[PDB]
């Protein structure tokens, strides 16, 4: 399969299928200790869930471009999603998207 | 809205075993998490643990192992804790609180414990 | 494991005016930390999530602000339902602090 539509479970970690989390442009950002082992399995995955593009959504909402190396040929996406303010949720998305973002930079 | 009624006052001999409940209501019991505090009078609080009545996970402190041991009941929505130091130590109150990853979001009246 | 310090253990002042208290962290925590209040004799109720967010019932004048290491709770406009003590969590690496800390008082 191609890596851009893996599954992050049990078996495959996501440090073992994503790469692991770092500071540099391709590699990722988002993890916590308890989401890079648990992975799909992790208790409030749903919640952050909500927050997938769909297939046509990721074409319709991101910026898109292609950047050719002599390395090979890259698309580069620009995204930006609104998160609802008057939902009773909105204190239950913050704490979720604060955790795990940039959590790299904690581990020992 | 969301409450957590806990138990009364509590006068206990040293070492004879304790147990401390709480009701939860108003939310989806399988949807959230219940921790534990302590404090003692003057002292500041202190993490003990948190369950999860779903897989019934739980990740005590270091500090806490073995002296303590959280229980959940879906049933009523209730968890308890049972402490076995009673060293005259932690003659203090404990709180029994919410929260979605550690952040504690409402709380309750509490208890208190004497030896 | 991350130990969380603050001081002035004992800090008054004025009704209506601008106080702030610190809280330095030994290890860094990113933007995970959360800030308590507790009247005497009664239970903790939460103030401000994320260091930045305040939670409903939480009245205004009830600012955070930092990242990293040095957070700041801002209070403006100090009222007298604010005699209290107040505390900071922090939340990326269990075990979990609670501070040791803050009483606001008047003067």
């Known amino acids: 399969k191609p890596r851009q539509k893996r599954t992050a479970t049990k078996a495959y970690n996501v440090t073992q299928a994503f790469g692991r989390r770092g500071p540099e442009q391709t590699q990722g950002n988002f993890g916590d200790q308890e989401l890079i082992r648990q992975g799909t399995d992790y208790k409030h995955w749903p919640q952050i869930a909500q927050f997938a593009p769909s297939a046509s959504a990721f074409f319709g909402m991101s910026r898109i471009g292609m950047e050719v190396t002599p390395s090979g040929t890259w698309l580069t996406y620009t995204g930006a999603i609104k998160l609802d303010d008057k939902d009773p949720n909105f204190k239950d998305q913050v704490i979720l998207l604060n955790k795990h973002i940039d959590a790299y930079k904690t581990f020992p | 809205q969301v409450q957590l009624q806990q138990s009364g006052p509590e006068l206990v001999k040293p070492g004879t075993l304790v147990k401390i409940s709480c009701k939860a209501s108003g939310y989806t019991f399988t949807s959230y998490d219940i921790n534990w505090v302590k404090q003692r009078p003057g002292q500041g609080l202190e993490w003990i643990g948190w369950?999860?009545?779903?897989?019934?996970?739980?990740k005590y402190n270091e500090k806490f192992k073995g002296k303590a041991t959280l229980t959940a009941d879906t049933s009523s929505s209730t968890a308890y804790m049972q402490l076995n130091s009673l060293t005259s130590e932690n003659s203090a109150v404990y709180f029994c609180?919410?929260?979605?990853?550690?952040?504690?979001?409402?709380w309750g009246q509490g208890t208190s414990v004497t030896v | 494991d991350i130990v969380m310090t603050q001081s002035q253990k004992f800090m008054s002042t004025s009704v209506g005016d601008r106080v702030s208290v610190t809280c330095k962290a030994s290890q860094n925590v990113l933007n995970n930390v959360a800030w308590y209040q507790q009247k005497p004799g009664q239970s903790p109720k939460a103030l401000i999530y994320s260091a930045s967010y305040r939670y409903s019932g939480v009245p205004d004048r009830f600012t955070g602000s930092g990242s990293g290491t040095d957070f700041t709770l801002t209070i403006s406009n100090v009222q007298s339902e604010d005699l209290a003590e107040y505390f900071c969590?922090?939340?990326?690496?269990?075990?979990?602090?609670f501070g040791d800390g803050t009483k606001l008082e008047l003067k």
């Open positions: 609180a919410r929260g979605l990853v550690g952040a504690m979001d409402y």
């Open positions: 969590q922090q939340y990326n690496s269990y075990p979990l602090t």
């Open positions: 369950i999860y009545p779903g897989d019934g996970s739980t």
